[PDB]
Amino acid sequence: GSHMEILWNEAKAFIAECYQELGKEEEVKDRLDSIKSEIDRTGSYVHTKEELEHGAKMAWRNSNRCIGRLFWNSLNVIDRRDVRTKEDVRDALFHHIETATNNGKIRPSITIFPPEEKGEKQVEIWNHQLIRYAGYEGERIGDPASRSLTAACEQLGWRGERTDFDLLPLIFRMRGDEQPVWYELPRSLVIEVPITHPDIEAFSDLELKWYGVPIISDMKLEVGGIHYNAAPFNGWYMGTEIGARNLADEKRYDKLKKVASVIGISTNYNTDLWKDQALVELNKAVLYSYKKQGVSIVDHHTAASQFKRFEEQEEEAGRKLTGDWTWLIPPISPAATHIFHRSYDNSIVKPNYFYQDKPYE
Amino acid sequence: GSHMEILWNEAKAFIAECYQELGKEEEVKDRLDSIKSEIDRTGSYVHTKEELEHGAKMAWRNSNRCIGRLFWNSLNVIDRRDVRTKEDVRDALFHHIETATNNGKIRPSITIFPPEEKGEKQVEIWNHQLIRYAGYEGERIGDPASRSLTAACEQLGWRGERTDFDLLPLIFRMRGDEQPVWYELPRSLVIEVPITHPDIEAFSDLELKWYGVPIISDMKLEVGGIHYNAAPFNGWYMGTEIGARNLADEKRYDKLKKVASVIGISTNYNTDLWKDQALVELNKAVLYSYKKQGVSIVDHHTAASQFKRFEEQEEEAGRKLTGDWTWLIPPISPAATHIFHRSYDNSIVKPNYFYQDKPYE
Ligand code: HEM
Ligand code: HEM
Ligand SMILES: Nc1nc2c(c(=O)[nH]1)N[C@@H](CNc1ccc(C(=O)N[C@@H](CCC(=O)O)C(=O)O)cc1)CN2
Ligand SMILES: Nc1nc2c(c(=O)[nH]1)N[C@@H](CNc1ccc(C(=O)N[C@@H](CCC(=O)O)C(=O)O)cc1)CN2
Numbered sequence: 001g002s003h004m005e006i007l008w009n010e011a012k013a014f015i016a017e018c019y020q021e022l023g024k025e026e027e028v029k030d031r032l033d034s035i036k037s038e039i040d041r042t043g044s045y046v047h048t049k050e051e052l053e054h055g056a057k058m059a060w061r062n063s064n065r066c067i068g069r070l071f072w073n074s075l076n077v078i079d080r081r082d083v084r085t086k087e088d089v090r091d092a093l094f095h096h097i098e099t100a101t102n103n104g105k106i107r108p109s110i111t112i113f114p115p116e117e118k119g120e121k122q123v124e125i126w127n128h129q130l131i132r133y134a135g136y137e138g139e140r141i142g143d144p145a146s147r148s149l150t151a152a153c154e155q156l157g158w159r160g161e162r163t164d165f166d167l168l169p170l171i172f173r174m175r176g177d178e179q180p181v182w183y184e185l186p187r188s189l190v191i192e193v194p195i196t197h198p199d200i201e202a203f204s205d206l207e208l209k210w211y212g213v214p215i216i217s218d219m220k221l222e223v224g225g226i227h228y229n230a231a232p233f234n235g236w237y238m239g240t241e242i243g244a245r246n247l248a249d250e251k252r253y254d255k256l257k258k259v260a261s262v263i264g265i266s267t268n269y270n271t272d273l274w275k276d277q278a279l280v281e282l283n284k285a286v287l288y289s290y291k292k293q294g295v296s297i298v299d300h301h302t303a304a305s306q307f308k309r310f311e312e313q314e315e316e317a318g319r320k321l322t323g324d325w326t327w328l329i330p331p332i333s334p335a336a337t338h339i340f341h342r343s344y345d346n347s348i349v350k351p352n353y354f355y356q357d358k359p360y361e
Numbered sequence: 362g363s364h365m366e367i368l369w370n371e372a373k374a375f376i377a378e379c380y381q382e383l384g385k386e387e388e389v390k391d392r393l394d395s396i397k398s399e400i401d402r403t404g405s406y407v408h409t410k411e412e413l414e415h416g417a418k419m420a421w422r423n424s425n426r427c428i429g430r431l432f433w434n435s436l437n438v439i440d441r442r443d444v445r446t447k448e449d450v451r452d453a454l455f456h457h458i459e460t461a462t463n464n465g466k467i468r469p470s471i472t473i474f475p476p477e478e479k480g481e482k483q484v485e486i487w488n489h490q491l492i493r494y495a496g497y498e499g500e501r502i503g504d505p506a507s508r509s510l511t512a513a514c515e516q517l518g519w520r521g522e523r524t525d526f527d528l529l530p531l532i533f534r535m536r537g538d539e540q541p542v543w544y545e546l547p548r549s550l551v552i553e554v555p556i557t558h559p560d561i562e563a564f565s566d567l568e569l570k571w572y573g574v575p576i577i578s579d580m581k582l583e584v585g586g587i588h589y590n591a592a593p594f595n596g597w598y599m600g601t602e603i604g605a606r607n608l609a610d611e612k613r614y615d616k617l618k619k620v621a622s623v624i625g626i627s628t629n630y631n632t633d634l635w636k637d638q639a640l641v642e643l644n645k646a647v648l649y650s651y652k653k654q655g656v657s658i659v660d661h662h663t664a665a666s667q668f669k670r671f672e673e674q675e676e677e678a679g680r681k682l683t684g685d686w687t688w689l690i691p692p693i694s695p696a697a698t699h700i701f702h703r704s705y706d707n708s709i710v711k712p713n714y715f716y717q718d719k720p721y722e
């Protein structure tokens with residue numbers, strides 16, 4: 001009833017906007033009639049290869065919390081709407097890691113899986129990221145942010161070595177199955193980068209490492225009323241995500257005191273700004289390490305400079321800019337970037353990527 | 362008409378809330394009747410010494426953009442509602458600088474001047490801060506943020522030496538005068554701190570300095586419908602205000618490249634994070650310098666820790682916490698503080714301090 005009404009309204013808005021950008025404004029009338037006939041016949045509609053390719057690109061362009069939006073039009077869209085089995089999903093996810101990694105020269109990619117038909121999912125990915133470390137809790141072992149997913153993987157038969165860097169398996173549920181299935185990640189497929197410093201030799205004693213590619217796999221892509229609940233995407237890392245958050249937060253790896261110890265500074269006084277000096281050296285180390293291994297990474301100053309060119313190009317194209325200031329500012333030296341000194345409209349424009357409820361927890 | 366209605370409604374709300382906090386809940390009825398008779402007779406009402414003292418304190422407690430709110434109840438309120446002449450205002454402002462500075466052991470203070478009667482001001486302060494540096498523009502000399510006020514002071518007969526650190530004069534307008542008057546600041550009254558580093562001797566070559574006390578003098582204090590347009594206040598500096606903003610911003614003193622030069626690092630690559638390393642050393646230098654001279658200052662980690670205790674105490678007292686995340690987070694290492702990892706309600710609660718239009722410009 002109301003579901004078929006919402007679907008048609010978002011479709012009219014998308015096709016018109018999409019074809020206007022692609023230079024196919026005359027093809028709107030004939031396509032919208034075919035879509036109306038399809039919604040009445042089946043209860044949904046299927047996007048063309050050109051439609052979802054541009055829809056996923058527009059969705060990136062509309063992502064308020066993303067600083068890397070300058071490269072929106074270079075997104076490599078992999079169409080996997082043909083998947084039917086758990087083996088097909090596994091091979092598609094393995095392929096995504098391989099092609100996106102590209103021996104270090106990271107290609108911004110997205111794999112599109114079959115969308116929701118009548119509100120029910122065809123493929124449901126449980127992983128936050130395709131490549132992520134496990135977390136356990138005695139004392140804290142691994143990534144605390146991965147605790148609930150690790151406990152869910154363990155309830156399914158998976159068991160990790162209990163090191164600080166255990167790779168979580170791929171865990172997803174197919175339509176018709178009550179519970180999900182899991183597959184361990186081949187070590188050859190996952191590129192990891194050991195963290196070293198360019199001047200301080202003792203930094204390697206910390207035995208820190210991180211994976212090369214952030215592949216968010218739990219977000220819903222919405223394109224013209226069609227909900228793609230399973231559509232993993234990736235860009236490359238901004239150094240601060242690893243050195244100022246993943247390895248620095250008290251609720252994550254909490255390495256600042258240990259970093260301060262190896263760089264030869266005291267942790268006695270807040271006034272010595274040891275945390276700040278530790279953050280600078282850890283972040284310098286992350287950028288050096290990824291570069292030395294030939295794995296794509298960007299520092300926060302270059303990323304902000306790239307985002308400035310995006311703001312300029314959006315104005316030149318006539319589109320309104322939307323952004324979330326609280327997320328666009330880097331967690332290290334935000335006032336040294338232009339982002340800090342201006343405001344952004346936090347309006348949600350469709351197509352976009354959205355948060356969806358976690359099946360575990 | 363509507364002005365006498367707004368005044369009575371804010372007065373009822375304030376007196377009830379104020380006396381409930383002071384343990385004088387029975388005295389509300391008798392005081393509110395006297396206020397009703399006063400609004401009908403004159404068109405306004407006069408606060409008691411206890412009323413505005415607590416009103417200025419509550420106003421600090423409600424300041425969303427302030428991280429130093431833990432010390433709200435220790436505010437030293439100076440009542441100068443007795444001022445009539447320009448000499449009286451000058452002596453009150455000189456007294457404020459002296460008593461607030463307190464030979465370096467800064468006392469959080471506020472001087473209350475006569476409020477607006479029928480929408481018109483009795484005393485109008487033009488200075489953003491009582492102690493502030495001039496700005497001119499060839500090339501950039503001084504503080505760019507002070508350009509318009511400097512040009513307004515010059516149009517009145519004032520002339521500075523054109524150094525990077527010229528002290529602006531006190532500039533204010535009395536009721537009945539079309540234009541403001543100015544008074545040069547006595548050098549003995551203004552404490553300035555030369556910036557040096559604890560380990561790097563070459564830092565003094567930059568010849569950087571800053572004043573000791575930030576006395577905001579252009580904000581309106583609103584207490585129970587009564588608008589105190591002239592009520593200068595001060596706390597002490599948080600190091601980041603000087604080292605990460607005043608001396609670091611591109612639109613302010615823009616010293617990062619020069620700091621990078623004296624600390625021996627290259628400004629070639631964004632990936633070396635020279636800006637971040639420069640910020641850490643400049644900020645370490647600011648904290649050391651103020652401490653060495655015996656001038657009160659707080660680092661961002663200690664200030665955030667103090668603000669956490671404020672959040673706890675507000676909950677313990679039963680009051681709702683209001684805050685502006687965009688301003689509460691320090692511009693250096695925000696993710697190393699608790700402020701970054703939580704949300705705040707940005708609702709405006711009265712009594713408060715507000716922005717008012719600049720008479721110049
Ligand atoms: C070109 C490389 C890219 C860079 C440098 C970049 C960088 C970032 C950064 C720094 C964040 C914040 C991360 C955090 O704080 O957790 C972010 C968020 C986000 N990015 Fe990008 N990004 C890139 C590519 C992509 C791509 C390829 C897409 C989509 C097709 C995308 C979609 C988003 C979304 C939706 C968020 C929000 C995630 C959330 O809410 O947790 N990004 N990105
Ligand atoms: C105890 C020492 C104090 C410290 C450490 C402190 C610190 C701060 C900081 C770091 C800011 C942001 C400054 C900026 O970014 O420009 C701020 C803003 C503010 N503070 Fe406090 N503060 C203190 C005392 C006071 C006092 C005594 C009052 C009021 C009676 C007050 C009222 C405010 C207000 C209204 C703002 C906003 C100013 C604006 O919007 O420009 N502060 N404070
Ligand atoms: N890159 C990046 N930036 C981040 C986070 C991140 O993981 N990555 N995580 C965030 C930590 N947690 C929050 C969550 C919500 C809010 C928040 O909501 N703040 C304003 C919102 C103001 C507004 O826009 O309306 C407020 O109301 O207080 C602030 C910090 C902050 N910024
Ligand atoms: N200490 C401190 N913090 C600051 C500034 C400061 O001088 N001092 N100056 C600020 C620089 N300029 C702005 C002004 C407004 C906004 C702003 O408005 N941001 C959100 C507001 C979200 C919200 O709360 O609704 C937005 O809509 O984009 C952001 C930066 C930022 N933070």
Ligand SMILES: N=C(NO)NCCC[C@H](N)C(=O)O
Pocket residue numbers: 129214216234235236237238241242246
């Ligand atoms: N850089 C990108 N997208 O390309 N980042 C996404 C979120 C990743 C998450 N912050 C992490 O550290 O794993």
Ligand SMILES: N=C(NO)NCCC[C@H](N)C(=O)O
Pocket residue numbers: 490575577595596597598599602603607
């Ligand atoms: N620390 C306080 N209030 O006590 N600061 C107020 C604003 C001062 C302004 N940021 C400056 O640097 O001059």
